[PDB]
Amino acid sequence: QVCTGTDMKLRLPASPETHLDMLRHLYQGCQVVQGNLELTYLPTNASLSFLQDIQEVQGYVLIAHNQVRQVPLQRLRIVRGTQLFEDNYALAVLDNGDPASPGGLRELQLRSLTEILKGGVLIQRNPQLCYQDTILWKDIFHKNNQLALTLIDTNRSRACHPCSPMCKGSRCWGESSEDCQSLTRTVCAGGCARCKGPLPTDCCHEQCAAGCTGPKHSDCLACLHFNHSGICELHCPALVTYNTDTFESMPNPEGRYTFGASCVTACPYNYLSTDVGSCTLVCPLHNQEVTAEDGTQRCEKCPCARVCYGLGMEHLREVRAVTSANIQEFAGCKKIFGSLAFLPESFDGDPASNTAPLQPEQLQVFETLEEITGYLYISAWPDSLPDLSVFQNLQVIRGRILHNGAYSLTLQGLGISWLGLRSLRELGSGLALIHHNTHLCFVHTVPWDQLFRNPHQALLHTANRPEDECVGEGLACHQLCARGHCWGPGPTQCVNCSQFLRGQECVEECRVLQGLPREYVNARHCLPCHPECQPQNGSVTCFGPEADQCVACFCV
């Protein structure tokens, strides 16, 4: 029911062939959009029925550069505007029109939208759009909306059918009788912020937003602040109460975490639980992340040890790419708080800022890297390097920050022939996008479903090297890779070994009983012997690597 929005603004989707698939995966079944609902560059034939359940948007709504004529958001009741398009608009409808029937948005059909808490409305250059000038927009803006500057272009290249004759006051989102605008603010008695009618009895509880079906904080169409199990309330119950004599902290059995506009018993997967009682993706200031025995992580206020920040964090907040100017900042980092993006400028250099091209050998700085809390984005890569094995120790990309707000892993326009991300076992959130890598095989040998953690995730892929061109050249998983899962060719690229590991190579059998030198197995790895251990012709030989655990000769 709760999903994450995007953060792409007007930027062009790199893969139009899969852009719509991404939106479907994000929003199918979703009712509450945490973040921004951005619907852009959609073609005339785009089926958008997967948006039909969206009821709340926490950030802004952007509908831009589409040729599709209808965007079905008829259940959207409230846009909270906690983020704003251009920092000013909760609703932006731009350039939806074409460069028999012409494309271009024809109606908004926001027939349930009765609440814009913060932000104005921007509607520009939509040549087929009607009814933006038959809506009393001031009714939708919340009583206390402090930023509602609004600019609505009403040039159109077609006649508009009048509102249905059943619409009171000639206000409607479209031509049908179901598109009449219901007023919930300007018709209220006693200046109450929202009502369901003209009398004082119709005033909503002040913790409601958007409207009501009755007088109580359980009759709201939306909560102004927090939904506490069907009750709209100003704040969630604290996780701690204080003993009334000592004021020592006591666990509160009714305590809840804040998550968007709701009170939850536990933070959802990939979110951090704070001591403040909030679910967050980025820890607040002066804090440190701690992993519990579950794998669940808590944020904790803090002599706080030094940390490796990636792009989008601290001094790298504005930095576009990993370059030769900042590459050394990641030396020895097991965990990068933030993201990594490799762009053409990373490896071309930039003479304007006198930034030298990033050399391939410098990418070895990531060999220690196990975890990226943000995303990994690679749109250029050294042609000499056949894979991404500089990240071969990377175990998880959390995706707490997502490229364009959607993608935790992006690989595009590269010359690599395989992935080589042989430790990658989790994409905590976001989609993977792998396209237009002309030489890249070993994409469908990866069990992507094992890496994902929620059903809104998927691999989107196109214009890589065709599966049959890879098969006809003999580029398949090694025989020792369990279930034909691998990240590249040979026995060092298996997801899971069929037998044993001697270091990085999957082998059929350790030299426990035969072969020289002898080895002992430990967690299905072939670790050797102390050389002064005489090889037993019959049985085992070593139980450890030192001369202590040694049979035939400190066995010196």
Epitope: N88, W137, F141, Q146, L147, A148, L149, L151
Partner: nanobody, 115 residues
Framework: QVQLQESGGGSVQAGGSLKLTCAAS????????MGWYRQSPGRERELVSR???????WHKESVKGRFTISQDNVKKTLYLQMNSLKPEDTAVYFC?????????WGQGTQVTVSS
Amino acid sequence: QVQLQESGGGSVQAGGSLKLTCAASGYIFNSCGMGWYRQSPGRERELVSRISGDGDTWHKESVKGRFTISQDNVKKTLYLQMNSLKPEDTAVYFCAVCYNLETYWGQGTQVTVSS
């Protein structure tokens, strides 16, 4: 009624400065944001600088550091101080005030930067 009117437009060289004045008359106040829009020929009217109803200031990135928005509650005026002007700032500038959730507009004043 209520009216907004801009003055102070003019023509300067690149690097010049101008101060636009938006004079409000009638019963109107900045309750839900006020600011300056600009519109070039063959281009959209777009927000440049803004003060919200609770006093938060915002500037379009291309004018950040060069434009200064201010107000005089006694005179009921909104100002846009423009320094280090660039040819790309050439446009008609409009003030807009949001009051009781309705947006009111001036007539616009021409600013021309030559280079």
